[PDB]
């Protein structure tokens, strides 16, 4: 559904006319394209911009790409593998499957691709999960090979990137789509999908409740179209994912009851949420913002909430067993709210 209405060119883009104009400007120099560092919130379509730029420079056949697996041996006697999706002109490295061996794989793969000889494109996904050693190796690779490897790295909140890397690449940002433009894209979607709308207020409602995240907005429109039989009326009970509802029920249990007898069940809910492929930082952010949204608290309680949330977010980023820090944060929250 969503992927069926994904643009495949800079002209097919229907958002951020400034950004598409600047990319049309940059695509005028296929012989000299500096390194790019795209940064912006999740679901803004930075990968769409990158693939459209690639389609503008190279042929439109860049979108039919094949997956491949590559296994290599490290300095020690461990032989580990990764999966790269490659195209006739570019390859996408995602140093996320591997835990601490980012530097060796990035070094080896870049040095191997940089001896194929008109250049090649390397798309680095999740450029914030790179250890500083891997980042330094990447910068030295950029320093050595500059005529075959033109790096384009997408990321969000580009604080964990050392200034030695920011200097070489062109910093490009992708602001979230405004509610008006989200509503426009939703209207185009429902028009090309002949969805029977009762009014246009549902589109603005979804744009507002989506918090400027384009892809989750489109996906929740998809999810709601299959619950109203393609006839979206004004009485639409907006559908949230399962984990958001679980986190909101946890927030309501925290607010309504403040005791260890409820902290046990809170730890149980945290265990059940974590064991089903959900990060710790996402749970912490959602729980903090949900607790801040509650209207029964004053300003001092909210200040204590945000301070403890910051402290335990730092501790989560420093630790390894997330359940401990999550239980500690919830215990301190229950203490302050008591």
């Amino acid at each position: 559904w969503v992927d069926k209405y994904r643009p495949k060119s800079l002209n097919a883009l229907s958002h951020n006319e400034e950004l598409t104009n600047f990319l049309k400007s940059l695509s005028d120099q296929p012989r000299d394209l500096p390194h790019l560092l795209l940064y912006g919130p999740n679901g803004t379509g930075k990968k769409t911009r990158c693939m459209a730029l690639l389609e503008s420079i190279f042929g439109p056949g860049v979108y039919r790409l094949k997956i491949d697996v590559r296994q290599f041996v490290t300095a020690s006697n461990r032989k580990l593998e990764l999966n790269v999706v490659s195209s006739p002109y570019h390859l996408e490295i995602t140093p996320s499957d591997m835990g601490n061996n980012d530097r060796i794989v990035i070094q080896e793969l870049l040095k191997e691709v940089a001896q194929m000889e008109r250049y090649k494109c390397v798309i680095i996904n999740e450029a914030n999960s790179l250890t500083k050693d891997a980042q330094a190796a990447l910068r030295r690779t950029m320093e050595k090979y500059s005529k075959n490897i033109r790096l384009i790295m997408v990321c969000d909140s580009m604080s964990p990137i050392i200034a030695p890397i920011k200097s070489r690449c062109l910093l490009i940002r992708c602001p979230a789509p405004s509610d008006s433009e989200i509503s426009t894209i939703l209207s185009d979607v429902v028009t090309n999908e002949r969805i029977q709308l009762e009014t246009k207020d549902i589109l603005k409602r979804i744009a507002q409740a989506s918090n400027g995240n384009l892809r989750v907005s489109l996906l929740m429109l998809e999810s709601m179209a299959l619950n109203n039989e393609l006839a979206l009326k004004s009485s639409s009970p907006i559908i949230k994912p399962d984990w958001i509802i679980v986190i909101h029920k946890l927030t309501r249990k925290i607010v309504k009851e403040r005791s260890v007898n409820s902290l046990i069940e809170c730890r149980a809910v945290l265990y059940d949420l974590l064991a089903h492929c959900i990060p710790a930082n996402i749970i912490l952010k959602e729980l903090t913002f949900s607790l801040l949204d509650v209207e029964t608290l004053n300003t001092t309680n909210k200040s204590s909430i945000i301070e403890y949330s910051s402290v335990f977010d730092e501790r989560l980023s420093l630790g390894n067993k997330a359940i401990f820090h999550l239980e500690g944060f919830i215990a301190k929250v229950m203490c302050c709210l008591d």
Partner: protein, 477 residues
């Protein structure tokens, strides 16, 4: 030669296929595959008969250690009357040595199987081979070219080739991706292990408290050989389970006592003694303290500090101790930090929230949750490895956003459209390279108001059979 001087694991080993506790389904699958391997060979391994287990030449066993994989394989091979040619880690399984020794015997026949019994009509497979490659995961650095040669042995073979490993999803075991069938042995449940332990105990003329048996089965984390070996220690009676077997339980009981941290009791039990109590078992003490530090009625509360503040400070110190443990395990040569960790994760929260135990000391559960998280992360990584070609997301945003609507499109038609929507469902399944196992995995990752394990079986089984038989006709890649 003596009935007594043998160990309790070898002496009480299974003999038939009804004493193997747990994993009955996998044992029956292996048996029904080995029995029909003959007809599979007759059909040149191209007609998947009724189970999809007729095209594969080699069966692969994997699972946690101490379940019966080796025993199940040997007993299954022996019941059918085959002849077991077994090679294990203790043999040099290099490429040249495998080509020399085993490869020349992939299609030959047995001499001992011939001469043992060939006159009475018992079974016609008394002379065939069943090559068991045990501990293929154990191919160390000294076995070069072994995994690839065994992957090649999976094909082009002429006899049943059973393979045993401990970690299927290890990268080294990748060449066994689709060229062999692979079944999984799960950790047996408490009921079967309890029945087996009761049989052993009454057979050895000694009785135990069932609660102690439950605590044992919990501590050993499902390993049957481990619990049997630990039970054999009873002969050499509260002292046995108090000191040697159930040590972390007693550590937690002593630490969470309220009379120790009192001034009257502290003078008799110094802080050095509590740090030694921690050092008794520095692998399970932190988890045991963190699991049940908030289930006691306290008695050391300050005049103006309720229970909630105490548990909050205890959890804060627990987080600090977790950070210290991570720093320790970042470099073992910093073992000097071990006493500090002792006070942070172990001594401080106990001293902060000590008192009297409300109920019973529950064993730690973080290990099972960690294992479940690892399994689900592996499954999600496989799903993303499949679906990345047409989604344009990361391995974590997938579960966050796409999984609810994917589950809707894949299941909700079965609730309202009945059974004719299969041609549509597979259609969606044909756009994202998903399979039936991928469909199950997608259906699994759901918690909250959208639980699916209850709903899944409500649909008619006829719909399941029709969907399975209709997916078998087409293939997307």
């Amino acid at each position: 030669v003596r009935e007594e001087d043998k160990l309790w694991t070898v002496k009480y080993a299974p003999t038939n296929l009804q004493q193997v506790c747990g994993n009955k389904g996998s044992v029956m699958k292996l048996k029904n595959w080995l029995a029909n391997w003959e007809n599979s060979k007759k059909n040149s391994f191209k007609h998947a008969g009724k189970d999809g287990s007729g095209v594969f030449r080699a069966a692969m066993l994997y699972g946690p250690p101490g379940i019966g994989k080796t025993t199940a394989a040997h007993l299954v091979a022996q019941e059918l009357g085959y002849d077991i040619l077994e090679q294990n880690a203790s043999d040099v399984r290099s490429k040249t040595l495998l080509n020399a020794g085993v490869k020349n015997a992939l299609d030959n026949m047995s001499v001992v199987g011939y001469f043992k019994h060939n006159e009475e009509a018992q079974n016609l497979n008394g002379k065939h081979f069943v090559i068991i490659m045990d501990e293929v995961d154990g191919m160390s650095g000294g076995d070069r070219g072994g995994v690839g040669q065994l992957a090649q042995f999976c094909r082009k073979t002429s006899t049943p080739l059973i393979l045993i490993c401990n970690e299927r999803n290890l990268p080294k075991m990748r060449p066994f991706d689709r060229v062999c069938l692979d079944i999984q042995f799960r950790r047996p449940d408490a009921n079967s292990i309890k029945s087996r332990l009761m049989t052993i105990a009454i057979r050895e003329k000694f009785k135990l408290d069932p609660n102690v048996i439950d605590r044992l089965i919990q501590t050993t984390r499902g390993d049957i050989r481990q619990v049997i070996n630990l039970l054999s220690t009873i002969s050499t009676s509260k002292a046995w389970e108090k000191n040697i077997a159930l040590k972390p339980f007693d550590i937690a009981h002593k630490m969470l006592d309220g009379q120790i941290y009192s001034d009257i009791g502290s003078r008799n039990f110094t802080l050095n003694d509590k740090i030694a109590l921690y050092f008794d078992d520095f692998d399970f003490t932190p988890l045991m303290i963190q699991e049940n530090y908030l289930s006691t009625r306290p008695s050391v509360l300050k005049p103006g500090q309720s229970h909630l503040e105490a548990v909050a400070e205890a959890a804060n110190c627990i987080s600090l101790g977790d950070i210290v443990e991570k720093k320790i395990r970042s470099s073992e040569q910093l073992w000097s930090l071990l006493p500090l960790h002792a006070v942070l994760s172990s001594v401080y929260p106990a001293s902060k929230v000590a008192g009297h135990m409300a109920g019973r000391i529950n064993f730690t559960a973080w290990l099972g949750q960690n294992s479940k998280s690892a399994k689900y992360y592996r499954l999600l990584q496989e799903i993303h490895y499949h679906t990345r070609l047409g989604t344009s997301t990361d391995k974590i945003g997938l579960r966050l956003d796409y999984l609810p609507t994917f589950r809707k499109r894949l299941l909700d038609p079965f609730l309202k459209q009945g059974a004719d929507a299969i041609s549509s469902v597979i259609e969606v399944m044909d756009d994202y390279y998903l399979t039936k196992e991928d469909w199950d995995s997608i259906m699994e990752f759901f918690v909250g108001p959208d639980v699916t394990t209850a709903i899944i079986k409500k649909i008619p089984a006829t719909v399941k059979s029709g969907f399975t038989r209709k997916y078998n006709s087409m293939t997307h890649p």
